[PDB]
């Protein structure tokens, strides 16, 4: 059965077997399938009909370029789907149809340019969405996010986001509350419109290694749910009183800040700056 049997009728390692399609010489009760590094090129409808028992499918670096409507139509118990490294250049509006139990979607490096046309509007069970390392330019969350009521982890790091406007998180208002861990680090971000995190419950915020020089006063006021924040490796402008707010704040919430936001030029910790009144 060319793939390796990690666990009888359960787990198999088919990576780098030079497959052009999904194998059929595997038990139907399979739960974990790793097909990474196989030139699959395309995924038509019912490409996993002979695996209605899957829960974890790894399709990393499979050279997949398109996924037709109902490609995973069968897979009703798939929990984790890894598509990392695939040069996707076409995604059917029903490409993810059939995944009624998907909790973790990993789409690192899949030429994603807009969450707008990202067909995940029907995945209510989605807990983690990792779309880091992509071409996303805007942080404006599509209104279909109001349907992803279980989403507790969102990674948009290493994309092309330049700023965070008040409208971006609009949708997160007209929907249920939840512990959302947001990662927006490693972005060419240099602006954050005032009051963009109000009424928004955030557990963790990652804004490190961007292009931020300053942040609106009171940007992190009512975030009692906040536990971890990253702001280090940013060209912070510590002139006064422009840096007054962030100074005191980061100084009070010291145990929350991971790493240390430093002043450009001096390299002085922003937390240890005191602006005269
Ligand atoms: C992985 O799946 C295979 C099925 O292809 C398992 O082997 C099969 O085991 C069943 C028993 O569950 C055997 O079927 C029948 O079992 C009854 C038990 O009462 C017995 O009375 C019958 O005579 C008959 O054996 C079947 O023969 C057998 N087939 C194979 C593969 O030889 C295998 O055990 C599974 N491995 C794991 C993960 O346990
Ligand atoms: C969930 O959101 C999608 C996207 O707008 C919508 O089509 C659907 O009716 C909503 N409810 C369901 C059926 O999940
Ligand atoms: C063959 C038997 O029935 C069928 C499946 O449930 C399993 O392969 C089991 O071993």
Question: What would you say this structure looks like, in words?
Answer:
It is classed as immune system. The entry lists the keywords LRR, protein binding, MD-2, extracellular matrix, immune system. It forms a monomeric assembly. Crystal structure of the TV3 mutant V134L. The protein is Toll-like receptor 4, Variable lymphocyte receptor B. The protein has a 12-stranded mixed beta sheet with strand order 1-2-3-5-7-8-9-10-12-14-15-16, with no helix packed on it. It is mainly beta. The longest helix is centred in the last third of the chain and has 9 residues, at 244-252. The chain has one helix at 244-252; strands spanning 4-7, 11-13, 32-34, 42-43, 56-58, 66-67, 80-82, 104-106, 128-130, 153-155, 163-164, 180-183, 191-192, 202-206, 228-230, 257-258. The chain is built from 1 helix and 16 strands. Strand 15, helix 1 (244-252) and strand 16 (257-258) form a beta-alpha-beta unit. The chain has a single domain (1-277), classed as Alpha-Beta Horseshoe (Leucine-rich repeat, LRR (right-handed beta-alpha superhelix)), CATH 3.80.10. The chain is elongated. A molecule of 3 linked components (NAG-NAG-BMA) is lined by residues 8-9, 27.
């Amino acid at each position: 059965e060319p793939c390796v049997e990690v666990v009888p009728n359960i787990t198999y390692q088919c990576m780098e077997l030079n497959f052009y399609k999904i194998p059929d010489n595997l038990p139907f009760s399979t739960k974990n399938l790793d097909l990474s590094f196989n030139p699959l090129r395309h995924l038509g409808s019912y490409s996993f009909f002979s695996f209605p028992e899957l829960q974890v499918l790894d399709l990393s670096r499979c050279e997949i370029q398109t996924i037709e409507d109902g490609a995973y139509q069968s897979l009703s118990h798939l929990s984790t789907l890894i598509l990392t490294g695939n040069p996707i250049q076409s995604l059917a509006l029903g490409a993810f149809s059939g995944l009624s139990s998907l909790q973790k979607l990993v789409a690192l490096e899949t030429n994603l340019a807009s969450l707008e046309n990202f067909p995940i509007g029907h995945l209510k069970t989605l807990k983690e969405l990792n779309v880091a390392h992509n071409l996303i330019q805007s942080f404006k969350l599509p209104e279909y996010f109001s349907n992803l009521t279980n989403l507790e982890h969102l990674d948009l790091s290493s994309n092309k986001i330049q700023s965070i406007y008040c409208t971006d998180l609009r949708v997160l208002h007209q929907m249920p509350l939840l512990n959302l861990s947001l990662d927006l680090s490693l972005n060419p971000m240099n602006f954050i419109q005032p009051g963009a995190f109000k009424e928004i419950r955030l557990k963790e915020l990652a804004l490190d290694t961007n292009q931020l020089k300053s942040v609106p006063d009171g940007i992190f006021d009512r975030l009692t749910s906040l536990q971890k924040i990253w702001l280090h490796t940013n060209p912070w402008d510590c002139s006064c009183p422009r840096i007054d707010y962030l100074s005191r704040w980061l100084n009070k919430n010291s145990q929350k800040e991971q790493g240390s936001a430093k002043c450009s030029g001096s390299g002085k910790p922003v937390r240890s700056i005191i602006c005269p009144t």
